[PDB]
Symmetry: C5
Subunit: 345 residues, 5 copies
């Protein structure tokens, strides 16, 4: 008979009145576009720009009764992407694009299949730079939720309706990792139905749960800031009269706590509000700070100076055995009131 | 009757004389374009480039009496964005673009509605890289103001006038945060009316107030630089004759003040004039610097050396009890003359 | 006779029925496209974005019987790249593009040669920003495998089949280096044959083995962190009663281990899970940490204090000669259980 | 009468012989294009790429006698930017573009006004990434001069001549700052008249004088490196026999000078030749270096050891009072021969 | 007579048979294209991407006998860049582009001049991002060679031949600097004549010799690492029994050598193989490392302990005078075997 590329020019040409600027079922029921995506790549979750990029296969299915045919024998036709301007396509856009583009390598990466009863499959390949606001109040112990919503732009709710299909709405490719986060296998699928002063515009969204890994911040930032506080408690076991040994220990410890803190503020993000890791590196500074000011109290009582001269040594050794036990206990109370309050949020 | 996409080709074609290069109300009163924006995204406020990017919905409403109609029954038509070149559009441009682009994902994100009496709604989606000069003289305690102005380019004041509409001129999306600043809910709306040697060009602007958050700079930079100055005053309570303990304290303290200062100059911005945080890390260096030079004065008087040999110890202990009280008081006077002068600006 | 540029317009014009939207051997056997690439450049293997860019010569060969000819005398014609839209080209795309583009400098860098029997050579020049997920669990001792796969987009398995040619499928240019990795001369060539709900789409892939060089991390990060652990064992040979010498050595060594660790966390990548180098800089911190706590045990036993007063010195010298030998031996056990477990993975 | 958009199509159509590829006054006197710019934005003066970006209004005025008219009543017409290809425009380009682009937001930002006698105004909006070589031999004390030149490309000197207009050739917008430099209000305006083997091509240039601000480098780099040199002179006033106090002072001072130096080499630019700030941080290292080697000379003479045993103490106290005065004087001679030689260049 | 823009449409129109897809001298001798470039800008030589960008004037001269004319009186015509698609242009491409683009600011920066006998001058303006592999084995003392080669793409050796002209093939603009390198005035010009399985393709290349400047690395990295090794030899002149002074000197010196090393690894490039500067900062670490282990040998022999008790002091002072001279001599032998081996390569 006649080839499919010439059959579609007969179906959508100047004859048959198919105007590509008019939706199907015009002045009637709204077009029911069903959508499902397929994530190929997912990463570079920035926290200064607060965005993340994704590389999807956006599939769209709707019904168009003007494209139904019965003369041609085979079931599923296909339109070349160069002739794609002669099809009513839904004006889908992402409500938080923040920049995006298509792919045009060796062929426009666009697919169109017109079925026999009028069903139309439309699959394209988009690289998105989608934006999600991130809340870094508890920085190592956080669970991020970055949304992905698909509004309509020009058609209102009574003309065009988006829906996720009932069989695998959001898939993820198998071999896909992240440098910091992990992607949970729990995709929430819900409506949003945006309102304006213009009208009710449809939208569907898919939420992704991003859990941050921990093992770098414990090994490099919590454990070295733990051992420096333990070294600051060695001063309680060294003799009281060894005066160059005590202040040489108490201040080289607050120097290696400052070096550990300042050396790791470049690896941390640059938000301007107090994190979880920022509290830990400011309270572990206090336990090294409060372990010299006891020696400012120990060496001053012993220097006051008959049994009255022996009483001041008897009080300086009293405060050297209280704080020998109190500082490994007050730091343990903080070590409980820090992890419990961040495993509960 | 006839479809809307064929009704606009009759209205704006070679018939009816609608020339798209000629403004409405030609050789008469000026066109009154009323505008309102809708910010979707707002962030990446750079301070080296001195710019910020915004993602807006630019809505424009004017009146074009050549587009009025009464034969077609429905009230609001719509033109497809492929046929948008047959409409007089206002030549709005941002006076501080510094680069911008449209969005063309799955459809040109452009909307046009011609009402029955001739009112025209025109809504597009722009990603701007707008520029605002920033004044970082008092860096943690600053209130930035970044403008957003909308000039005309080719039409003068007697041909085209921009105005903000009287009902919600600038909206902001709800779930929108910033890494460093916060966005106040107070938008100043005013005219600017730019002049040149060419003529009076209209412009309307919208100012955004950006208050900088504080909690990172106190916990990581002010409080750790505070505790180092407190540790430098421990030298006044340690004994005078403990010579390896005093200079081992006074210089490991100026080393941990240099380590705290140099480790945080990478997180700070890179402007070349003195900030608020740069005065603090240069005066807190002086109090550690002036706490060794007293011991250079203490140890030198005691080394001068009968009651004349006991007078020099009596003067060295005098200056070790004056500066034991004076340095926590002179530093308190600076700590009042620093925050009061930056909560008043 | 007639020129070749006018002979191809007769062969592919409105006459002869050559429709460029229809594959050869239509409704018959599938088109056998044979492919081979030629890497010109290869580098910038990022580990935050997890991608790498490559600059290839993509050559494609297929058979198109509608382009066969016998009237023109010469064997191989050539079509100009401006007239390239009148050829059925395969819709090859890379399944992990993550952005790509052509090259259009002084001429479209595209080549087409139609042979006499219908064989078609098609060579283009593409810059890819291909993505490979990287596994930095053992960071200096790792072997990366970054794939490069070539799917079809619109044609299924029974219409278009990709194959590597049997003579040099993947070549690499000669003078081509890398900043960190080395590129092995072993290219795995295999099929993948992706399935969807749409159909069987063909794909061929080529794997590249990337081995990381070592010489920077040994000279700058392993050997300097080795010598600091050796300096921390000098404390066992210095006298027991030299109390400012022991704690002055044990804590300036944990300060130069913190300075070596924090100064090198900027050169390392910023993944959030524990590496191989991150274990080494956390266990070598413990051996400097555990060499002061022995002196907290030595100086405390000697301070307890007749032959009972001489027994406590006899036990403090016992633990000062056990750990004089034990710490160079326990660190040797870790130095065997660290390299063996990373030369075996 | 007739509208202006239809009057210019009569004036420049297929009738009247106006060919847009032929300059006015053909085979006669050269076209005198007078130019003036208007800088909107100016910043991001990079010193690794050695470029700076500017956002200008480029106005061009020439005479075109083929566009003169007398039938239409009004004085100044205007051509829409879509119809701008039917005008002879001068082929102005910037000789050091290094990348540039136009602006096309909501309308092409282009302006054209044909006057009655034939004078043509042409104003566009360009974002340039202009390049200027920078000479960082004396880095904080430098005055940069970055040119901006406007050549012709295809027409020689006897066909097209560029000139700055005699009334405000280069303006700058009012509220315009820079992060590091300041922009002087003194614009040099001169010709360059480039020669090649092709011919004499015209060019005009405008020079901008950029003076670098100072207040950050004094407060953060010169004054903290000054106070460390003063602390290194405290060793001359401490007693000679206090041997752990002297070398503990002289080497913790060369450590805080190294920490001040290495902590600030990330904020400095990364050129590979010696700056002004690089001499200051290498000579102030010597004054701390030369304050320990005197103590290596003090402690060695006193250790040589009857009145001959008292002569070695009598010489060690001689060199401890010479260098008590000499080092605050030799450093003052350097402090004069450093600022005078950099305020004179 | 007739204008030049209408004479070229007569010469290259549908009349006269000039087909722009066919080279001159078809089925005859190959076209001899002679080329010469003119570098406007040259910089941003990256070593992570291993590329450099250049901004050139590419001039091409060939002969086309179909464009010869004798009726028009003047010698040199010119074609407007809008009508440039009706000219056979050579398909020159750079073999290592790695991305490039043209310049289209106020006019397409393209020049074409057709002489009377058929000689065709063609000058364009290209911004290249050319790639050169760099060998950083001896990093401060290196001489880089970055090539620039110009292949043909579609025409083989028997159809199109590139040559450099015999009079100034590569010029460089006068006022042109670099941040790190210097550009030598010695350009090698040679052929390469690439082979494939496709055929012999012509290519000509130009080599640029880049020499790295030295003065920053001596002043900031070699001299401060030199003076720290000199300070580590002060320990040999201080008294043997001053035990807190020796280990306080030997380990604050290995701390300021680690601070000098770790603070400068951010300014160095990030290749993963050992450099020249990386050997220097790892051998100068050993001379500070081996200056404490001698004191571990000095203090241990003196602690062994009648004239047998005086023999151990007599051996400890022997090794304190051998290594007083040996370490300034062994370090001098390394200082000769380090510069001589890097001035010879
Ligand atoms: C696309 O989806 C819309 C909404 O999901 C469909 O519109 C709905 O059509 C059904 C039947 O065609 C109607 O709902 C029910 O109809 C019965 C019979 O008239 C009536 O008794 C019920 O009270 C109810 O209205 C209704 O017209 C309409 N809306 C809703 C909310 O159900 C539409 O059919 C779908 N397909 C197309 C091609 O548009
Ligand atoms: C667009 O806005 C402009 C300015 O806002 C309008 O022009 C103004 O039109 C009004 C009446 O149409 C005039 O103002 C007053 O008119 C009365 C009656 O003639 C006169 O007695 C007053 O002295 C005053 O002029 C005036 O012509 C004009 N300008 C101002 C400043 O009021 C215009 O009508 C608006 N609409 C359109 C479609 O252009
Ligand atoms: C392109 O490649 C395909 C598959 O590689 C080729 O299709 C294969 O064609 C061969 C012979 O033309 C057939 O295989 C065998 O054919 C014999 C003879 O009929 C039969 O007895 C065997 O049982 C077997 O089917 C077969 O039709 C087909 N598929 C396979 C799997 O062999 C094709 O010929 C190639 N060329 C073109 C121009 O498409
Ligand atoms: C554009 O500018 C050029 C140069 O600035 C103008 O060309 C100059 O025209 C003037 C008079 O039209 C001539 O200069 C003098 O002319 C008198 C009278 O013939 C003669 O006695 C003098 O010796 C001198 O040549 C001259 O032809 C020409 N060049 C110079 C250097 O003055 C031109 O008129 C301007 N306008 C246009 C529309 O091209
Ligand atoms: C472009 O360049 C090519 C090669 O440089 C030129 O081709 C050469 O043309 C010359 C003479 O036209 C020939 O070389 C010699 O010719 C003499 C006389 O026939 C013969 O006796 C010698 O043995 C030698 O072949 C030759 O045909 C050819 N190739 C070489 C290698 O010399 C060509 O003429 C240049 N011009 C054009 C417009 O193509």
């Amino acid at each position: 008979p006649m080839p499919p590329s010439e059959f579609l020019d007969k179906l959508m040409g100047k004859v048959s009145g198919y105007d590509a600027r008019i939706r199907p079922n015009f002045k009637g029921p709204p077009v029911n576009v069903t959508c499902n995506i397929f994530i190929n790549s997912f990463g570079s979750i920035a926290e200064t720009t607060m965005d993340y990029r994704v590389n999807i296969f956006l599939r769209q299915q709707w019904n168009d009764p003007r494209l139904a045919y019965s003369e041609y024998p085979d079931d599923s036709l296909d339109l070349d992407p160069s002739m794609l301007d002669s099809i009513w396509k839904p004006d889908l856009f992402f409500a938080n694009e923040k920049g995006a583009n298509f792919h045009e390598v060796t062929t426009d990466n666009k697919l169109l299949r017109i079925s026999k009863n009028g069903n139309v499959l439309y699959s394209i390949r988009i690289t998105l730079v989608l934006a999600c606001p991130m809340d870094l109040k508890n920085f190592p112990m956080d669970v991020q939720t970055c949304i992905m919503q698909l509004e309509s732009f020009g058609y209102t709710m009574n003309d065009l309706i988006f829906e996720w299909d009932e069989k695998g709405a959001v898939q993820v490719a198998d071999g896909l990792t992240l440098p910091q986060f992990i992607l949970k296998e729990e995709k929430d699928l819900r409506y949003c139905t945006k309102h304006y002063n213009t009208g009710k515009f449809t939208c569907i969204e898919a939420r992704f749960h991003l859990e941050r890994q921990m093992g770098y911040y414990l090994i490099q930032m919590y454990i070295p800031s733990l051992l420096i506080v333990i070294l600051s408690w060695v001063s309680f076991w060294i003799n009281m009269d060894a005066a160059p040994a005590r202040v040489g220990l108490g201040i080289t410890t607050v120097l290696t706590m400052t070096t550990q803190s300042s050396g790791s503020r470049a690896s941390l993000p640059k938000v301007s509000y107090v994190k979880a890791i920022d509290i830990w590196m400011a309270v572990c500074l206090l336990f090294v700070f409060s372990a010299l000011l006891e020696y400012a109290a120990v060496n001053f009582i012993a220097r006051q100076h008959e049994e009255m001269r022996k009483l001041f040594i008897s009080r300086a050794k009293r405060i050297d055995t209280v704080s020998r036990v109190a500082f490994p206990l007050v730091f343990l109370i903080f070590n409980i009131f820090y992890w419990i309050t961040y495993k509960i949020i």
